[PDB]
Design a protein around this ligand. Sequence first.
Ligand SMILES: Cc1cc2nc3c(=O)[nH]c(=O)nc-3n(C[C@H](O)[C@H](O)[C@H](O)COP(=O)(O)OP(=O)(O)OC[C@H]3O[C@@H](n4cnc5c(N)ncnc54)[C@H](O)[C@@H]3O)c2cc1C
Ligand SMILES: Cc1cc2nc3c(=O)[nH]c(=O)nc-3n(C[C@H](O)[C@H](O)[C@H](O)COP(=O)(O)OP(=O)(O)OC[C@H]3O[C@@H](n4cnc5c(N)ncnc54)[C@H](O)[C@@H]3O)c2cc1C
Lengths: 394, 394
Amino acid sequence: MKTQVAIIGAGPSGLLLGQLLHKAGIDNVILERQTPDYVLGRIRAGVLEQGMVDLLREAGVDRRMARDGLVHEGVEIAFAGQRRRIDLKRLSGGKTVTVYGQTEVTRDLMEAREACGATTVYQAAEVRLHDLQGERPYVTFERDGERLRLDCDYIAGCDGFHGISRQSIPAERLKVFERVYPFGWLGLLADTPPVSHELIYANHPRGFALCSQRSATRSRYYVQVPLSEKVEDWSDERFWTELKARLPSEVAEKLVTGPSLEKSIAPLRSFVVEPMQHGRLFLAGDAAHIVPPTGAKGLNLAASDVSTLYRLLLKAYREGRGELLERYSAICLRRIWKAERFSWWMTSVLHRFPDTDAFSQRIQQTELEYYLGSEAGLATIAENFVGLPYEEIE
Amino acid sequence: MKTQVAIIGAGPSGLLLGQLLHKAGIDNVILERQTPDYVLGRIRAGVLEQGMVDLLREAGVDRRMARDGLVHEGVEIAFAGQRRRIDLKRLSGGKTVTVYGQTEVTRDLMEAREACGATTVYQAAEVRLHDLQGERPYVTFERDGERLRLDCDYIAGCDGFHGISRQSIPAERLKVFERVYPFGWLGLLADTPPVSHELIYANHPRGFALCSQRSATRSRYYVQVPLSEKVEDWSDERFWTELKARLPSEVAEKLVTGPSLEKSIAPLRSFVVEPMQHGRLFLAGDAAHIVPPTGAKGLNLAASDVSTLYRLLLKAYREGRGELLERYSAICLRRIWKAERFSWWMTSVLHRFPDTDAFSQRIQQTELEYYLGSEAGLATIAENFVGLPYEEIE
Ligand SMILES: Cc1cc2nc3c(=O)[nH]c(=O)nc-3n(C[C@H](O)[C@H](O)[C@H](O)COP(=O)(O)OP(=O)(O)OC[C@H]3O[C@@H](n4cnc5c(N)ncnc54)[C@H](O)[C@@H]3O)c2cc1C
Ligand SMILES: Cc1cc2nc3c(=O)[nH]c(=O)nc-3n(C[C@H](O)[C@H](O)[C@H](O)COP(=O)(O)OP(=O)(O)OC[C@H]3O[C@@H](n4cnc5c(N)ncnc54)[C@H](O)[C@@H]3O)c2cc1C
């Protein structure tokens, strides 16, 4: 088989890159390990940046998002008996964020790729990458027991944290930066109306809680849990009693509860590799970096890596400027590290940590009181939360 | 002996409280352990907030400060080969800071107290405080071997970190918050012209450096040093070679060096006690709290504790409103904890720490790049650095 760009991974990064590229006339094949149905079972993200909303419109896949996505103009933080609204729109200079589930975005891209007839191979087993510093890279994989070869000019590793393409770079050429946090998030999806029209992040003595949503009749809630926990110990009953105990009383009284559609625990991690490319392999999304879910930045950083890679591959194919591709990692990493610092900051001030002496507990509380009480403080949260601007380039 | 307010400590907190009170007609005695000359040997602070400048004018002791103090409109931070100016005046809404040495402020207050004839007992040995929850507190002390008693209505503990008055409160009534940092500052005073017209804080791989001043012909420099260091291992020569190595090359080339007038190491500490009062004893200044020198807040928090105590003692004596004194600690601690959080933040992003994994090193660098590159980021530094407004009260 032969193509121009081989994309490893059919989650949101690989599908959005594939759609952008197809629309500009650049042929591409996506290889995915799993089935369509397994990819669509993953709940994950709910919050999209405007930058991400504009990229879906650029890829022509925004009809359902513009109908069904909810635009949010603000977010609440609750701490020490008080609730504080951050007017994102006012403080960021008119930007907002959009709530539309990752499942939905992925289904829309999948429906779009299928219609235009572009290649996607699902159940592609044992993907291997070869001759990365050559002129002619190739990918081998197995389909129904026979080993096939796909020849390409470039490879985009969009295969998430446990994918083959970061593992295919000589470990000595990579610098890893990682922090593992001593807690996870227990998340619960329920077909119930959300308890507020905006998000509520809560710092409570028992641990963090977050109230979020998917639509007017579907809700998504999170509580901080130790790493030792397993989801079979948390009945629906136990989760709603614990959520209610971590919220302000006038918010817990209004809570409509109900059976879970989905329940799961996600560990919190920060992870960055430098560089994000090797020869003709370019990493994008969770393959190159992980942020804790607290700043809602993972899928949105995937969007700007993909946006930066699409514009540089377009310069390389339409305009013959293949040299501009060496700049991919420097351009992406400026943005990645600022969103990593915001996600770390949010995580630090909203969660209950283990080694906590009396001084750090009080500095944590005073960080919330300063940033939420000052107009300049509020603006640093708001501009980071809506998403810092993408780099123009050339 | 009998007085209205007994003040333990003749450093800047006790002298400024004493002057304010004398000027409003409220009699007061200051007791100091040391001699005038020992108190005047301490170099310490160089940066005063406007709030502090206005309080010295209110106490009538500002003639030399208005002549000789330098008003600064901005400050520089240097990190990773670049220098960034924070325009304090622009970003704080017109506030500036004033550079006038602590030695000078203290001499001016001392000269003022002497002239007006108010009581000061120096070499007051073994000060003890008695009957703190009574109607009639008293202080005993020794002068030339004989033990004398001073009767008073109130006692102000302005005796710094190692003073008797925090030790005189039942330990069970106090909550202590403390962080000890794994480094100190080696400071050097030299009769040389400053290397810049504004302050330069420098984060360097070898450790922190700070370029500061006392006048057009006197300079004060600091380098971060391990706690194991002793000042006799640091010759003038060794200090200037190390200062130069931590600065941008175009700043080290312009440096005029010279012999030290004073050299000393100061350990970095954060410390807060809650409450700041017990019965008829009120703590003020370093007796109640310590901040690391990095945000220039210690003497300025002493000024606002004293300002808050003077206005409440005035309501108690002129207006009979002695009940308003129970509010002293709650009013002071709102301000103390925000300046403690700023001083901790400055310390964290400007110094080289020991346990430093690759992720934290990069978050430290990204904090500097975000706060210094964003207008909202720059405004949070600038409003904290000029001093957050004092509480109005009643
Ligand atoms: C609890 C939670 C909440 C989050 N909330 C948000 C939020 O609100 N906002 C936000 O911006 N981000 C959020 N995120 C992050 C976001 O979901 C991810 O960053 C996003 O899924 C990244 O997409 P991706 O395509 O890079 O990776 P993935 O979604 O992981 O997809 C990669 C694909 O590659 C496939 N693959 C893996 N290995 C191979 C292989 N060897 N061969 C072939 N295919 C392979 C996988 O099967 C997978 O389909 C959240 C994450 C979690 C877990
Ligand atoms: C290196 C350094 C740099 C600094 N830079 C700045 C800066 O630029 N800006 C800023 O705002 N702050 C800065 N500070 C902090 C500032 O110097 C202090 O917060 C300030 O000295 C507090 O004044 P005070 O009167 O409360 O205490 P002190 O100055 O400590 O004086 C207390 C007095 O009480 C006396 N005393 C103690 N025990 C007894 C007793 N038992 N009986 C009687 N008398 C007693 C002592 O002899 C002393 O004279 C700096 C400090 C250091 C060390």
